Amino acid sequence: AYSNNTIAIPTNFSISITTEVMPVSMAKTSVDCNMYICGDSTECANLLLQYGSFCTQLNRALSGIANQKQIANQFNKAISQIQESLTTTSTALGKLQDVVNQNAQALNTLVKQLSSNFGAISSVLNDILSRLDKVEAEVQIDRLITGRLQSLQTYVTQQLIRAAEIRASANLAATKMSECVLGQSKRVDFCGKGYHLMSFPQAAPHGVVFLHVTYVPSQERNFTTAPAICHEGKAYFPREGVFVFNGTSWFITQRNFFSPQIITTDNTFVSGNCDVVIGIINNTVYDPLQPELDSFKEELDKYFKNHTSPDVDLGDISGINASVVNIQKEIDRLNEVAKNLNES
Amino acid sequence: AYSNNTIAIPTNFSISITTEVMPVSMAKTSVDCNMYICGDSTECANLLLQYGSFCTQLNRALSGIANQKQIANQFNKAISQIQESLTTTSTALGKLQDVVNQNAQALNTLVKQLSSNFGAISSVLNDILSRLDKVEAEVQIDRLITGRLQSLQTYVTQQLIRAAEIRASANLAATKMSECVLGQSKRVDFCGKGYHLMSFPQAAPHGVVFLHVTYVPSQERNFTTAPAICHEGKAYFPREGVFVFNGTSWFITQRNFFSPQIITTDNTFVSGNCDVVIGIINNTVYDPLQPELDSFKEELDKYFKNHTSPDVDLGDISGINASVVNIQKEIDRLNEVAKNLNES
Amino acid sequence: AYSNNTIAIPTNFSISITTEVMPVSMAKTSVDCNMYICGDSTECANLLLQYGSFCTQLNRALSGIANQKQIANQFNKAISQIQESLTTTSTALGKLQDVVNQNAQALNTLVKQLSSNFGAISSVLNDILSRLDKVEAEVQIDRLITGRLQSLQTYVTQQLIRAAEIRASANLAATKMSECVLGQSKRVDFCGKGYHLMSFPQAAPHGVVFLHVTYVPSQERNFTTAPAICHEGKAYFPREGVFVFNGTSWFITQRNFFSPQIITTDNTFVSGNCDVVIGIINNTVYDPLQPELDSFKEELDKYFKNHTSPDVDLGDISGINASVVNIQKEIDRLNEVAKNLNES
Ligand SMILES: *[C@@H]1O[C@H](CO)[C@@H](O)[C@H](O)[C@H]1NC(C)=O
Ligand SMILES: *[C@@H]1O[C@H](CO)[C@@H](O)[C@H](O)[C@H]1NC(C)=O
Ligand SMILES: *[C@@H]1O[C@H](CO)[C@@H](O)[C@H](O)[C@H]1NC(C)=O
Ligand SMILES: *[C@@H]1O[C@H](CO)[C@@H](O)[C@H](O)[C@H]1NC(C)=O
Ligand SMILES: *[C@@H]1O[C@H](CO)[C@@H](O)[C@H](O)[C@H]1NC(C)=O
Ligand SMILES: *[C@@H]1O[C@H](CO)[C@@H](O)[C@H](O)[C@H]1NC(C)=O
Ligand SMILES: *[C@@H]1O[C@H](CO)[C@@H](O)[C@H](O)[C@H]1NC(C)=O
Ligand SMILES: *[C@@H]1O[C@H](CO)[C@@H](O)[C@H](O)[C@H]1NC(C)=O
Ligand SMILES: *[C@@H]1O[C@H](CO)[C@@H](O)[C@H](O)[C@H]1NC(C)=O
Ligand SMILES: *[C@@H]1O[C@H](CO)[C@@H](O)[C@H](O)[C@H]1NC(C)=O
Ligand SMILES: *[C@@H]1O[C@H](CO)[C@@H](O)[C@H](O)[C@H]1NC(C)=O
Ligand SMILES: *[C@@H]1O[C@H](CO)[C@@H](O)[C@H](O)[C@H]1NC(C)=O
Ligand SMILES: *[C@@H]1O[C@H](CO)[C@@H](O)[C@H](O)[C@H]1NC(C)=O
Ligand SMILES: *[C@@H]1O[C@H](CO)[C@@H](O)[C@H](O)[C@H]1NC(C)=O
Ligand SMILES: *[C@@H]1O[C@H](CO)[C@@H](O)[C@H](O)[C@H]1NC(C)=O
Ligand SMILES: *[C@@H]1O[C@H](CO)[C@@H](O)[C@H](O)[C@H]1NC(C)=O
Ligand SMILES: *[C@@H]1O[C@H](CO)[C@@H](O)[C@H](O)[C@H]1NC(C)=O
Ligand SMILES: *[C@@H]1O[C@H](CO)[C@@H](O)[C@H](O)[C@H]1NC(C)=O
Ligand SMILES: *[C@@H]1O[C@H](CO)[C@@H](O)[C@H](O)[C@H]1NC(C)=O
Ligand SMILES: *[C@@H]1O[C@H](CO)[C@@H](O)[C@H](O)[C@H]1NC(C)=O
Ligand SMILES: *[C@@H]1O[C@H](CO)[C@@H](O)[C@H](O)[C@H]1NC(C)=O
Ligand SMILES: *[C@@H]1O[C@H](CO)[C@@H](O)[C@H](O)[C@H]1NC(C)=O
Ligand SMILES: *[C@@H]1O[C@H](CO)[C@@H](O)[C@H](O)[C@H]1NC(C)=O
Ligand SMILES: *[C@@H]1O[C@H](CO)[C@@H](O)[C@H](O)[C@H]1NC(C)=O
């Protein structure tokens, strides 16, 4: 750089109060989560019970801010053969009576007690449906609560960052009530704008209101300005000074205004050369270090189950029919032989 | 303002060391989530596996801090009619045998294989109950984990805000090891209280302990003090000075103590008027901008299912009975005719 | 402390530009959650719909940054007794016909309509399985989303803390464009290293690049240095000075270099004693107040259900058999009597 250029250097001034305000404390922002999250749907209050005791410690942080007898005997034999036949028929039909009734008893057993199986399975199935739907409903609510929860946590983080700004600004308030009040700071546009004379401190709800009695340049000039000059391979350093003309005569003044005092030997300092030392750059950087998230595919497929299956539950188990008898020609010929028997 | 008032202005001093401490670094607070979240219930460790790799990158941020033959033939015909009748009866009862046994075979089919249907449905229903209860249990755990998780995330946010305060305070430490150590700062109650002479820097675990050799006013006076005076519609500005009396004679002194030097022309600066310039107010404010959350009603009713339904599962399907035969008068009259047949 | 020691005090200087950079603003880091959370698995986008409107307000904060007739008649009576017997048999077998067919009708009723019960229960059971597996899948996804969500919320918190550092650093930029530009700050190694002469401000994308024309000590000496001396139980205070020798003769100089001006009476100030005032320690501390989390055992066992149960669903309800008739000796003797009847 090194070059002579021009800085507005003040000529005539004026009084100037400043009256700046800088906050020092914070309200105890005890924010209820149950109100910020939840407005209605008492269900939400039933589920945020299960969400920890997060709001307590959250507001703990926020609080910590602030020849023819042959016929007779033979057909008598035949009649006792018919006697054999009909006692035989009584045997058959008694067996049929007990077994057809036993299979009907098994039928009643199945019907009654298998209705009871239907009743048990149907009640269990309805309760499965009920609690499945409770799971569905509350799970959707939990999605919504979790998003709204991290929004609230962002609210609290925003609040804490404000609390940190307020703490550092109160440190600046303590430093200014040191220097501006209990001293006359020789710093341009600090302790209010212009050149500080005295400051008047006064309180506020959460601030410290300053009343800086200062003075500002009412009148000046765009005037030439040189940091250092190199006559002889040889630099010149104005102690508490800046190289200035009067219309082309090199003088050195104060910075605050110019009564252009002549170049002495004492106020100038000298280097044996005019060799610039190059300085270091680029401070105040911070690395965030929030590094990386991979896919859902990696994250999921480490820890995941697909896990489905249908049933079978055949039902052709039912589907086999009942064959029947519908014959009655036996009854027909039976009663027609009964006609024949009453005939002769 | 502008008015003459009174500031304690120092008279006699005393030596004063200060010995302040300002931290510069932080411990590597590698906080395990599995310990801060989880203390017991290995179940919790089974579920926090599924909770991402959040704790890794979380501690990455925290790490980045640091004639009578008629009879014979006719009744022989009738006897063969009875032969027809009993072969006919054999036909009927064989049909009944096969069909009653077939309906019993269908009954055994239903009983065996429909027990197998009950076994399949009951095992599936128990597994439905099992995994439903796993869902219920782990879902409640997930509520609790999510609340405790955001409490941990608040812990980390609190920690990072401390890290930011430490970084800015270490910037102040670098600035004070510049000015207090390598210079004699002309700043009241900076570089320790009082007026700095020299500071002695020394290390600490995570701080830089200063030893500010300063000097403080042991003796002073509540004494009158004026910023500027307006004789002639015309202001007066003491350069490095403050208007002071000796008991009513206007002098201007240093701020640091008063040897009340007389009003010169050079130390006073003058405005042509006494016109206050009014200054700007109210800096250092930040807008949080955390704006808004609506109801659960809006948020929910965009994306929600109620979604319930019962079954029917009739059971009168069972409830139709089995009619029976319980008659035996046929057997009674049958064996009584058998008595009659053995009679004659 | 109080002791005479040695500070490098400058002798000959050199010009030195500094060229430091301090950022003042931030890019509008409108970070999409749907990209930072979600990369693939459109399912994830189906579930993050249910996760509030968190990303909107999240980026609202981030945006707010920037003889043989006896025989005839008697056996005619017996023949009508057989007529009674076979009409009686017709009665029995008609009753058996209707009842065996009725129990078969009940069997068909059970088979058809109980297949319909199996169909209803099986379809409901498959849908239970389906939506249970949807619950399982999406619940695991919600674990993963919640962990990745708080990682994103940590990203945003990290970003906001950077925004606070940038706001305070821009306050330092405003203070340096006050003092370094519009003044000549008498502060060592502030407004760039060395001793400030003038600074040249120039813009940047998000910074304010300074060009501090300063001057640094090219040449100096480790030289003795005393804060205060106690001849007579009586201290000595060099105003804008430091006690210095020339090779053992006590002088007081400037801090910036040494032309060792003689000890006057005016530049030294005096205490009547040599009594050190001890100062206060250990500022800039903040209490985090993130206090406490108890066990899962406390947190859980306040609000938790274990809640399991099996079924019974007997199945011996089926398991009772069907007894049968398999007899046919009646048919055998029946047709053998039919042989006997056709004989005679
Ligand atoms: C400014 O600096 C130049 C050298 O760059 C010098 O020759 C000149 O005399 C200086 N003054 C003016 C008024 O240009
Ligand atoms: C010179 O004065 C003008 C007045 O209009 C103002 O722009 C500024 O003070 C100076 N101009 C420059 C530095 O370009
Ligand atoms: C600067 O110096 C004198 C005295 O201040 C002034 O009168 C004159 O106009 C200027 N120029 C010179 C001496 O060349
Ligand atoms: C640098 O120091 C030496 C030491 O005697 C002195 O002779 C010389 O004048 C100094 N240089 C300047 C420019 O003052
Ligand atoms: C300052 O440092 C950052 C580090 O990321 C770099 O990107 C930037 O280019 C540097 N500034 C200049 C002017 O090179
Ligand atoms: C297995 O999981 C993947 C993961 O997206 C998904 O497509 C589906 O639920 C399952 N089945 C198949 C065939 O991918
Ligand atoms: C009725 O009987 C059989 C038994 O094997 C069954 O499979 C089928 O459905 C029916 N038979 C027909 C319709 O011919
Ligand atoms: C059947 O025969 C009997 C005698 O065997 C006699 O009463 C009559 O002729 C017939 N009818 C009735 C109804 O008895
Ligand atoms: C204070 O200011 C008033 C004007 O407000 C002036 O008359 C007076 O002389 C000053 N001094 C004292 C000691 O009151
Ligand atoms: C005047 O001195 C008293 C001493 O008790 C003290 O309150 C303060 O220094 C002054 N009082 C004021 C300014 O009200
Ligand atoms: C203030 O000035 C003189 C000299 O310091 C002092 O003796 C006198 O008492 C004071 N008052 C006057 C001169 O009215
Ligand atoms: C203001 O500047 C003019 C310019 O010559 C000068 O005459 C006047 O004395 C100045 N005013 C004061 C109060 O110094
Ligand atoms: C400072 O600005 C804030 C902006 O919200 C305002 O509320 C407050 O009233 C201002 N201060 C004064 C003293 O008016
Ligand atoms: C539909 O959802 C609402 C939402 O609170 C709730 O009352 C219930 O689960 C459902 N039914 C009715 C009738 O509101
Ligand atoms: C048994 O039979 C009928 C079949 O239609 C059934 O509905 C009913 O329960 C029973 N009848 C009675 C008890 O009269
Ligand atoms: C039945 O009649 C037979 C001959 O027809 C004869 O043995 C007896 O009288 C009766 N009883 C028995 C048991 O046979
Ligand atoms: C340093 O201080 C001691 C007293 O501690 C004093 O006797 C001595 O003369 C001083 N100077 C040197 C050069 O040691
Ligand atoms: C004295 O000079 C040496 C030069 O090597 C350097 O270590 C430092 O400036 C001084 N040494 C100290 C203070 O121990
Ligand atoms: C310090 O003072 C004189 C004059 O600066 C110097 O010549 C001498 O060497 C020193 N020592 C004394 C006077 O003992
Ligand atoms: C302290 O103040 C008194 C008041 O007159 C004065 O006599 C004495 O000299 C002062 N002490 C010092 C060391 O100046
Ligand atoms: C500073 O205060 C903290 C408060 O926790 C304390 O632990 C520490 O020991 C103090 N420093 C010293 C040097 O005692
Ligand atoms: C009850 O809950 C506990 C909690 O860990 C767990 O062991 C299990 O799920 C249940 N049963 C028993 C016997 O503990
Ligand atoms: C078949 O009949 C009975 C009915 O009580 C049933 O309990 C059992 O399983 C069978 N009886 C046997 C195998 O003896
Ligand atoms: C049975 O007897 C009838 C007459 O009663 C006669 O036709 C024959 O002898 C026998 N066989 C058949 C097939 O009728």
CSV table of C-alpha atoms and ligand atoms in Angstrom, one decimal, chain B residues 73 76-77 80 83, chain C residues 341-343, ligand 24:
chain,number,residue,atom,x,y,z
B,73,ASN,CA,-99.8,-121.2,-4.0
B,76,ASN,CA,-96.5,-119.0,-1.2
B,77,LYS,CA,-96.9,-115.9,-3.5
B,80,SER,CA,-92.3,-114.4,-1.8
B,83,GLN,CA,-89.1,-112.0,0.4
C,341,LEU,CA,-88.8,-117.8,1.5
C,342,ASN,CA,-88.3,-118.4,-2.1
C,343,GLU,CA,-87.7,-122.1,-1.2
D,24,LIG,C1,-89.6,-118.0,-6.1
D,24,LIG,O1,-90.9,-118.4,-6.0
D,24,LIG,C2,-91.7,-118.0,-7.1
D,24,LIG,C3,-93.1,-118.3,-6.7
D,24,LIG,O2,-93.4,-118.1,-5.4
D,24,LIG,C4,-91.3,-118.7,-8.4
D,24,LIG,O3,-91.2,-117.7,-9.4
D,24,LIG,C5,-89.9,-119.3,-8.3
D,24,LIG,O4,-90.0,-120.7,-7.8
D,24,LIG,C6,-88.9,-118.6,-7.3
D,24,LIG,N1,-88.0,-117.8,-8.0
D,24,LIG,C7,-88.2,-116.6,-8.6
D,24,LIG,C8,-87.1,-115.9,-9.3
D,24,LIG,O5,-89.4,-116.1,-8.7
